[PDB]
Amino acid sequence: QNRGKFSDEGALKNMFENYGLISLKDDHIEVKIIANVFKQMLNNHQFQDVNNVVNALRDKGFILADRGRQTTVFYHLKLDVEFASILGL
Amino acid sequence: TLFEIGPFALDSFGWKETIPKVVRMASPIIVNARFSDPITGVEKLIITNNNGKKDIFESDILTTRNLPSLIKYGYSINEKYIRSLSYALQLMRDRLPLSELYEGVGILETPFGYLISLDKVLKSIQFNQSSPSYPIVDSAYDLTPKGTFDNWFNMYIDEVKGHLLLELAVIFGISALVTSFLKHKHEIEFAGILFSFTGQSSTGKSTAAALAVSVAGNPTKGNETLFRSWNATRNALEGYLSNNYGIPIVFDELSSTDTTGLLYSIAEGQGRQTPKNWGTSVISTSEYSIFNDSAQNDGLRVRTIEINEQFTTNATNADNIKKAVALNYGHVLPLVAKYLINREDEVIQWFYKEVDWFEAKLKDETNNTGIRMFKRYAVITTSAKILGRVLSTDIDIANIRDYFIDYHTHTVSERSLADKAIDVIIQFVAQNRGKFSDEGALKNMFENYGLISLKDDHIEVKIIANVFKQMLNNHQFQDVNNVVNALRDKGFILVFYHLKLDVEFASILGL
Amino acid sequence: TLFEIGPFALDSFGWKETIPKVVRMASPIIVNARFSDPITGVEKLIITNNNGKKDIFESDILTTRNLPSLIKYGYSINEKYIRSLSYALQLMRDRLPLSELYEGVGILETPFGYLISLDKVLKSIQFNQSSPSYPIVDSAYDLTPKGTFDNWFNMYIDEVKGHLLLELAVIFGISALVTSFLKHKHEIEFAGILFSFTGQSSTGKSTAAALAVSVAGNPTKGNETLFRSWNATRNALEGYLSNNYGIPIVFDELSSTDTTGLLYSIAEGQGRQTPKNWGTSVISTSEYSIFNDSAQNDGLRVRTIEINEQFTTNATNADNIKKAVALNYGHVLPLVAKYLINREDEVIQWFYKEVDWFEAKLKDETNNTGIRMFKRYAVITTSAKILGRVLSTDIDIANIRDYFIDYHTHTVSERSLADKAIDVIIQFVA
Ligand SMILES: Nc1ncnc2c1ncn2[C@@H]1O[C@H](COP(=O)(O)OP(=O)(O)NP(=O)(O)O)[C@@H](O)[C@H]1O
Ligand SMILES: Nc1ncnc2c1ncn2[C@@H]1O[C@H](COP(=O)(O)OP(=O)(O)NP(=O)(O)O)[C@@H](O)[C@H]1O
Ligand SMILES: [Mg+2]
Ligand SMILES: [Mg+2]
């Protein structure tokens, strides 16, 4: 929905509002998303604790091991690769 | 003939008066003790029978208007004789001496020392020696022991021992009475800690929570118990805590309740509008943090400790614990009480040893608010040692010390406005980079937040004051000056604040 | 036989009546003094026994409907004789003279002068001379001394003396009575200052706050004390301040409470809807400013002074103070009271000296609202001098003067609508 605010070439060059950085990787898509934005999107979909969701996500290997702002700048999410067409990758 | 005055006489069959005919007035109605409340002036009375019935009334029960209401409480009265009977009972309490009524549970303050009020009342060496009378106390909970110490201890060995967090849970519960005891001795100034068991669903929170309060009384939902929910008004939560200085209580599940003020309220036994006053420790349970929808305030993280770890190892462990405490409770804290009373100096010295250990192991903390946690970690370890002696079982104090040394270091950035704030700021720049210009001029034709410049091993971000204030309000900070001043001290800082950010952000910020 | 009329008699064992037979109808019940409220008309009574029990009732306690309720208050009554017993107690109070009841704490206004109501009651040279009565006062707090002056003073030397802000904190607390005393003398028109201890968490605020009120009474949380919280309605905050014109009170932690309106209310003893009227100084404590969520009004910054500095030097400094004041309190302000009473002219001249000093040191202030702070800084320094005499210790008055000259100069642009406004404007343009 907010693809417009994720830049591809490593720099946050959306002049109106930046949510993160998106990169097509080998059989996964790296979506780096700003923490605050991640918190807000969770409150808005009626999650009520970030950390719980974060570790929950990490256990299935959605967020990865020790790269990102975990539980104890960005969250580093990996998404299934073949979404790449629709995400304009 | 248990009592007589003038024409009125009390025997084991009741009251009677004599005239020129001897008539029965009432069932046995006995006045055992009167009390006088200083500020109000209002007197109170213990009214009994010979079948061990005990009730406390305001003395105006003895007016002819009110006395028949004793029939509600099981007595019998002949209202043809209410006027005398009212007078006879007044005469009876006149003969009584003035007594004093202490109300509450835990450590009760007394001009003749202190009491420990639990289910029975435990007097201290200072008080026992100093008062020439039996103290009288309002029980003020259930707390009556169910089952055996043996069973409780058996589940302790089988389901708790060797498990750090489930051990903490037992410590925490006795640490209410211990903490309160130390405040009473002015060895600490805080009167208790708010503990919050958080984490994901089905992980033993409400279980360890019941385990914690099984120390002094009923850990189940019911009439008058230590296991309760957030489901009520502030009027009644605060109301159930009233006159509590040593009993742990559980508030289970926030979900069934903007919490800032309430957190504070707990740490300090202040009621609303006379006030209800307490000084005890309280365990919360929730699927979401309590610093979630709260101010970004340091004083909040200080009088609160939140454990976000799984307590029980498996589903059976939990189901085994719950069953054990529902059936056996209230056996440990009396032991802790006797221990506090008979080994007072010993505990105070223990506490000193622990405070000194924590001070020494954390001598790198400059932050005032971090030094403030020192005496808090050290009431818990001190409480652990007593748990150890009392149960006569081995408890690894090293692991509990270290657990908190490890809790501290991972909570350092959260007692520091500077660290919390610089964080929203970096993402604010990242997120709203579009509104920060590079070439010195505010040339965003929609909205300008500031100016950004790549400097030598730092990035200069000049940000408009108003914008800086507004973002802080939006992330639930509540004083600019405070945040600014905090940031200025770690060397982070009429138009802009001049922020310096770590250089290697330069790539993503398009510098 | 302490009293008699007709067949009704009061002996040391109680009341009794006689007929053509003598019956006992009540415990010792004594009417010691009556008062009459002008606007209301309603009379009041001091009812006692032989054991120094004292309570104030509206005189309608003596009606046969109400009198039995004295049994709640420990007395004994034979309700076979309530109709008589009511009349005798009426009769007894007819014999009493009219007295006047002054209610409150601090400086109590009297047509025969002024009183200082603390825990005991201190008469002034003007009052002592003119009326033939033992004044009767509603104590209206605890304020009873605990421990020793010596301990409090030892804490003062060991933990306070030489430390500016912790010294102010003691000054501020006694300055309630002094400020009020000066208003009463029309040497100032404001009745008190709202003080706000702000700054970061764990910096001695609630400590300096207890330190401040230990001058007049209990500085700890409890039944009836000077250390309280924001946790209530406006209805009860205002209600606890009622009839207070000289005792400092602490409101601890805003966090457990758009504040514009409440600030004003404090500076002027204005209740809501009769009203509760006060005139005292009050200390707030908070991790965030009170001018945070308030109007951009000058009149707000004027009747409030906010200290955003650390009070205690280290963590032990605080803990020693809290412990010292919890155990020893209420010894200083009585001294200040006696000093005010026996050295009235001296204090007023002192005050003048300070006001003129500040006027001279700040003769560049054109801003009306800044000149208005002059007499405020000067009640505080004046209070410091009295603290100095009273404790018999040296207090550097220069440092307290200059602290406020420096408070002033760094708060100038906040008393200036223009300076705040041009500041919002440049950023609005940017
Ligand atoms: N460690 C565990 N592993 C798996 N299941 C568990 C565990 N602990 C508890 N459960 C299950 O959860 C049930 C209730 O546990 P409980 O102590 O109430 O945890 P809880 O955190 O309070 N649940 P909730 O109130 O929804 O957050 C038990 O009867 C078990 O079926
Ligand atoms: N100057 C200080 N330096 C370091 N720690 C301090 C200092 N003053 C107080 N503390 C710690 O803070 C505790 C109580 O703080 P307190 O005097 O109430 O300040 P405070 O401003 O009221 N804290 P808060 O209510 O959270 O804003 C003491 O027992 C110490 O542990
Ligand atoms: Mg649960
Ligand atoms: Mg405080």
Side-chain angles (χ1 to χ4, degrees):
Chain A
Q1 194 185 327
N2 292 307
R3 182 60 173 81
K5 305 194 194 196
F6 291 93
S7 305
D8 297 344
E9 301 171 329
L12 300 172
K13 52 185 157 193
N14 181 287
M15 58 179 63
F16 304 122
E17 188 178 23
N18 283 281
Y19 284 166
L21 299 145
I22 186 174
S23 195
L24 175 55
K25 301 294 185 183
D26 285 70
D27 274 274
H28 81 87
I29 301 175
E30 178 171 34
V31 184
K32 290 180 183 86
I33 171 172
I34 292 178
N36 171 47
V37 177
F38 189 84
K39 302 162 161 50
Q40 289 300 336
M41 78 155 301
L42 287 184
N43 309 348
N44 300 359
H45 293 81
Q46 287 295 304
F47 292 86
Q48 310 189 346
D49 187 293
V50 190
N51 298 353
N52 274 312
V53 173
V54 175
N55 282 339
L57 291 173
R58 186 180 71 209
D59 289 19
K60 292 181 179 179
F62 274 127
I63 297 166
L64 226 50
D66 282 19
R67 188 169 179 172
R69 181 181 179 170
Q70 311 197 306
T71 306
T72 42
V73 190
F74 300 101
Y75 294 101
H76 288 220
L77 306 180
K78 293 168 59 178
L79 274 52
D80 177 85
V81 50
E82 281 197 344
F83 291 124
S85 289
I86 59 180
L87 291 173
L89 300 177
Chain B
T1 306
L2 186 147
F3 179 81
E4 276 203 0
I5 293 174
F8 322 120
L10 175 63
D11 63 47
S12 178
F13 295 77
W15 277 97
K16 51 183 190 179
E17 185 187 30
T18 306
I19 43 171
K21 291 171 283 293
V22 172
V23 294
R24 194 183 186 269
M25 296 186 152
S27 65
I29 303 175
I30 306 163
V31 187
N32 287 65
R34 54 172 176 89
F35 330 97
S36 300
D37 179 277
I39 62 180
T40 308
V42 161
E43 192 185 78
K44 282 189 174 175
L45 297 176
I46 295 176
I47 311 300
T48 75
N49 51 16
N50 282 333
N51 291 11
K53 184 146 169 47
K54 183 179 180 178
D55 297 302
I56 287 180
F57 299 89
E58 291 184 317
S59 299
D60 62 346
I61 184 67
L62 294 187
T63 61
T64 63
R65 187 180 179 254
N66 290 343
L67 185 42
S69 297
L70 280 185
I71 288 167
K72 186 161 70 169
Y73 292 82
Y75 302 79
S76 293
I77 282 167
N78 189 344
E79 279 182 68
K80 305 201 184 193
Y81 298 122
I82 196 75
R83 273 184 312 180
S84 296
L85 179 61
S86 64
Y87 192 56
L89 292 162
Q90 273 149 81
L91 291 181
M92 176 179 276
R93 64 84 181 266
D94 290 334
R95 300 294 186 67
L96 288 179
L98 179 53
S99 314
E100 286 184 354
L101 188 74
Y102 315 105
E103 299 183 320
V105 189
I107 292 127
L108 296 186
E109 313 279 347
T110 298
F112 301 100
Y114 79 76
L115 282 164
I116 310 271
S117 170
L118 288 170
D119 181 51
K120 262 68 195 303
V121 173
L122 231 100
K123 302 186 297 172
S124 61
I125 295 162
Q126 179 171 3
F127 181 104
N128 201 333
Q129 291 179 13
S130 288
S131 175
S133 297
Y134 309 79
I136 301 173
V137 194
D138 208 82
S139 188
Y141 280 123
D142 174 276
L143 307 182
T144 300
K146 193 184 193 106
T148 66
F149 175 86
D150 279 10
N151 298 135
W152 191 94
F153 187 57
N154 183 75
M155 73 83 21
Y156 186 90
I157 305 290
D158 292 330
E159 317 290 353
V160 176
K161 188 178 182 314
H163 297 139
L164 186 66
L165 298 160
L166 298 171
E167 277 180 324
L168 296 183
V170 188
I171 288 154
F172 290 177
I174 58 158
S175 82
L177 187 65
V178 183
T179 298
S180 196
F181 174 84
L182 270 41
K183 181 180 180 180
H184 167 82
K185 289 305 198 184
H186 288 282
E187 310 288 20
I188 43 169
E189 292 310 331
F190 61 85
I193 305 117
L194 162 65
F195 299 110
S196 165
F197 294 167
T198 205
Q200 289 177 156
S201 180
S202 313
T203 48
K205 303 192 291 279
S206 307
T207 290
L211 173 56
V213 285
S214 56
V215 296
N218 194 316
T220 64
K221 38 160 183 175
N223 309 331
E224 247 194 319
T225 75
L226 321 181
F227 196 94
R228 294 223 150 185
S229 69
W230 287 102
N231 204 48
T233 41
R234 290 193 67 175
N235 201 317
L237 279 187
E238 292 186 350
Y240 204 51
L241 303 182
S242 78
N243 277 14
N244 194 16
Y245 318 107
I247 299 286
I249 304 282
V250 185
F251 295 165
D252 198 45
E253 197 73 68
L254 291 172
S255 283
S256 180
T257 199
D258 304 16
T259 52
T260 297
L262 183 51
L263 280 58
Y264 284 95
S265 305
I266 287 298
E268 316 206 18
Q270 304 265 23
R272 272 196 195 263
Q273 189 164 359
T274 73
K276 307 301 197 167
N277 276 7
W278 62 86
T280 191
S281 297
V282 61
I283 289 133
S284 179
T285 288
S286 56
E287 296 190 62
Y288 65 78
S289 168
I290 52 182
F291 311 134
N292 186 82
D293 304 303
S294 84
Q296 294 269 351
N297 293 341
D298 286 3
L300 196 65
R301 315 302 187 285
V302 172
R303 47 202 93 199
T304 299
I305 291 183
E306 186 174 9
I307 295 166
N308 185 5
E309 302 182 23
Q310 183 185 302
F311 293 93
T312 62
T313 189
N314 65 42
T316 316
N317 184 29
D319 275 8
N320 277 350
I321 298 175
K322 273 191 188 183
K323 174 190 158 191
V325 306
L327 297 166
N328 307 264
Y329 60 80
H331 309 275
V332 180
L333 203 65
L335 296 175
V336 183
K338 293 178 199 61
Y339 199 100
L340 292 173
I341 283 181
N342 289 340
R343 313 289 303 166
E344 173 164 323
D345 304 285
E346 193 202 46
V347 173
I348 305 189
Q349 294 297 312
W350 277 359
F351 173 57
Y352 288 147
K353 193 183 181 307
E354 304 305 301
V355 179
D356 225 284
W357 191 88
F358 274 94
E359 286 180 2
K361 296 287 296 191
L362 290 167
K363 67 176 181 177
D364 295 332
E365 193 82 337
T366 66
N367 196 350
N368 307 348
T369 51
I371 298 177
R372 184 165 176 196
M373 305 289 270
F374 291 174
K375 286 188 178 179
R376 283 180 180 76
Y377 303 152
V379 293
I380 291 172
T381 56
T382 293
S383 277
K385 286 179 71 180
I386 303 180
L387 190 71
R389 303 265 181 293
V390 159
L391 295 178
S392 319
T393 187
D394 207 317
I395 292 173
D396 192 12
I397 309 285
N399 278 19
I400 298 177
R401 277 170 163 180
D402 282 17
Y403 174 80
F404 281 117
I405 299 304
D406 201 275
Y407 170 97
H408 190 88
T409 59
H410 300 172
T411 311
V412 166
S413 70
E414 302 161 21
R415 291 184 284 279
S416 162
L417 275 168
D419 283 352
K420 314 194 250 176
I422 188 65
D423 196 44
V424 289
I425 292 173
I426 297 168
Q427 290 155 212
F428 180 87
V429 179
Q431 196 184 328
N432 292 308
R433 180 59 173 81
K435 304 194 193 196
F436 291 84
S437 305
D438 296 344
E439 299 172 329
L442 301 172
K443 54 183 158 192
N444 180 286
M445 58 186 63
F446 304 118
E447 187 178 23
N448 284 282
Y449 284 168
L451 298 145
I452 187 173
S453 194
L454 175 54
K455 302 294 185 183
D456 287 71
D457 273 274
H458 81 87
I459 300 175
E460 179 171 34
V461 182
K462 290 180 183 85
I463 171 171
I464 295 177
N466 172 46
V467 179
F468 188 96
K469 301 160 160 49
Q470 290 301 335
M471 66 164 281
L472 288 185
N473 309 347
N474 300 359
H475 296 294
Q476 290 296 305
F477 293 86
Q478 310 190 346
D479 187 293
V480 189
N481 303 352
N482 273 110
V483 172
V484 178
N485 286 335
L487 292 173
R488 183 180 68 207
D489 288 19
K490 292 181 179 179
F492 272 121
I493 300 165
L494 318 155
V495 193
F496 309 104
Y497 297 104
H498 284 218
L499 308 179
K500 293 167 57 179
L501 273 51
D502 179 85
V503 47
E504 284 194 345
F505 290 124
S507 289
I508 60 180
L509 293 175
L511 298 176
Chain C
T1 306
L2 189 149
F3 180 82
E4 278 204 1
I5 293 173
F8 320 122
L10 176 63
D11 63 45
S12 178
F13 299 79
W15 280 96
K16 52 181 191 178
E17 186 186 30
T18 309
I19 42 170
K21 295 172 283 293
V22 169
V23 296
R24 189 179 180 267
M25 51 178 55
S27 64
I29 302 175
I30 304 162
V31 187
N32 287 66
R34 51 171 174 88
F35 349 102
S36 300
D37 179 87
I39 68 180
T40 308
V42 161
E43 192 186 78
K44 280 189 173 175
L45 295 176
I46 297 176
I47 310 300
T48 75
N49 51 16
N50 282 332
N51 293 11
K53 180 144 165 45
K54 183 179 180 178
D55 296 302
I56 288 180
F57 300 88
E58 291 185 317
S59 299
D60 63 16
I61 185 67
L62 296 188
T63 61
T64 62
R65 179 182 173 254
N66 291 344
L67 185 44
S69 296
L70 279 184
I71 288 168
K72 186 159 69 169
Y73 293 92
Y75 300 79
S76 294
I77 284 168
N78 190 343
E79 280 180 67
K80 305 197 184 192
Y81 296 119
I82 199 75
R83 272 183 312 180
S84 297
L85 178 60
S86 64
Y87 192 52
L89 294 163
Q90 274 150 81
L91 290 180
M92 171 172 288
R93 67 82 192 276
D94 292 334
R95 302 294 184 66
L96 288 179
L98 179 53
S99 314
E100 284 187 354
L101 186 73
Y102 314 103
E103 298 183 320
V105 189
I107 292 127
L108 296 185
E109 316 279 347
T110 299
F112 303 104
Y114 80 79
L115 278 158
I116 309 271
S117 170
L118 289 171
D119 181 51
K120 305 298 189 302
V121 171
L122 290 180
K123 300 167 294 175
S124 61
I125 300 163
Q126 181 170 3
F127 180 104
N128 202 331
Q129 289 179 12
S130 288
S131 176
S133 298
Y134 309 78
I136 304 174
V137 192
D138 208 82
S139 188
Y141 281 126
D142 174 275
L143 306 182
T144 300
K146 194 182 193 105
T148 67
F149 174 97
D150 279 10
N151 299 137
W152 190 93
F153 186 58
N154 181 74
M155 172 267 305
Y156 184 90
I157 305 290
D158 292 330
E159 319 290 353
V160 178
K161 189 177 182 314
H163 297 141
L164 187 66
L165 296 160
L166 298 170
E167 277 180 325
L168 296 183
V170 189
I171 289 153
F172 291 180
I174 60 156
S175 82
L177 186 64
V178 185
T179 298
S180 196
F181 173 83
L182 270 40
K183 180 180 180 180
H184 167 81
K185 290 307 198 185
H186 286 282
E187 310 288 20
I188 45 170
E189 292 310 331
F190 60 84
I193 304 118
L194 163 65
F195 299 109
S196 165
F197 295 169
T198 302
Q200 290 174 341
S201 179
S202 313
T203 48
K205 303 193 291 279
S206 307
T207 290
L211 174 56
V213 287
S214 56
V215 299
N218 192 316
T220 63
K221 36 160 182 175
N223 309 332
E224 247 194 320
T225 76
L226 319 180
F227 197 85
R228 294 224 151 185
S229 68
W230 288 102
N231 205 47
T233 39
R234 291 193 68 175
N235 202 316
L237 280 188
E238 291 185 350
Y240 205 52
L241 302 182
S242 78
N243 278 13
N244 195 16
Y245 325 106
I247 296 287
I249 303 283
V250 184
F251 293 164
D252 198 44
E253 197 74 68
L254 292 170
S255 283
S256 180
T257 197
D258 303 15
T259 51
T260 300
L262 184 50
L263 279 56
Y264 285 93
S265 305
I266 286 298
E268 315 205 17
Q270 308 265 22
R272 271 199 195 265
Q273 187 168 359
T274 72
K276 309 301 196 167
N277 275 8
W278 63 85
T280 190
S281 298
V282 62
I283 291 132
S284 179
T285 286
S286 56
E287 296 190 62
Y288 65 91
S289 168
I290 56 182
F291 311 137
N292 188 82
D293 304 302
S294 84
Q296 293 271 352
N297 293 339
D298 285 3
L300 195 66
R301 314 301 188 285
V302 172
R303 48 203 94 199
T304 300
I305 287 184
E306 184 176 8
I307 293 166
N308 186 4
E309 303 182 24
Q310 183 184 95
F311 293 93
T312 62
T313 188
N314 64 43
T316 315
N317 183 215
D319 276 7
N320 278 350
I321 294 175
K322 274 190 188 183
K323 175 191 159 190
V325 306
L327 295 165
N328 307 264
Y329 59 78
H331 309 276
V332 180
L333 203 65
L335 295 176
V336 183
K338 292 179 199 61
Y339 197 98
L340 292 172
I341 291 180
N342 290 341
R343 312 288 303 167
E344 174 162 324
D345 303 285
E346 191 203 45
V347 174
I348 304 189
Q349 294 296 313
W350 277 358
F351 172 58
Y352 286 145
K353 194 183 183 307
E354 304 306 301
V355 181
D356 222 285
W357 189 87
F358 275 95
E359 287 179 2
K361 296 288 297 191
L362 290 167
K363 67 174 182 177
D364 295 332
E365 194 81 337
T366 66
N367 197 350
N368 307 349
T369 52
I371 294 177
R372 186 165 176 196
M373 302 289 270
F374 291 175
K375 287 186 178 179
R376 280 181 178 77
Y377 304 154
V379 293
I380 291 172
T381 55
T382 295
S383 277
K385 286 177 71 180
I386 301 181
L387 190 71
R389 302 266 180 293
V390 159
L391 294 179
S392 319
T393 188
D394 205 317
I395 292 173
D396 192 12
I397 312 286
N399 278 19
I400 294 177
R401 276 170 162 181
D402 281 17
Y403 171 81
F404 281 119
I405 301 304
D406 201 50
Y407 171 99
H408 191 88
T409 59
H410 299 172
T411 309
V412 165
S413 70
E414 302 165 22
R415 291 186 284 279
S416 163
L417 280 166
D419 284 352
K420 316 192 251 176
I422 186 64
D423 206 341
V424 296
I425 290 174
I426 297 169
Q427 291 154 33
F428 180 86
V429 179

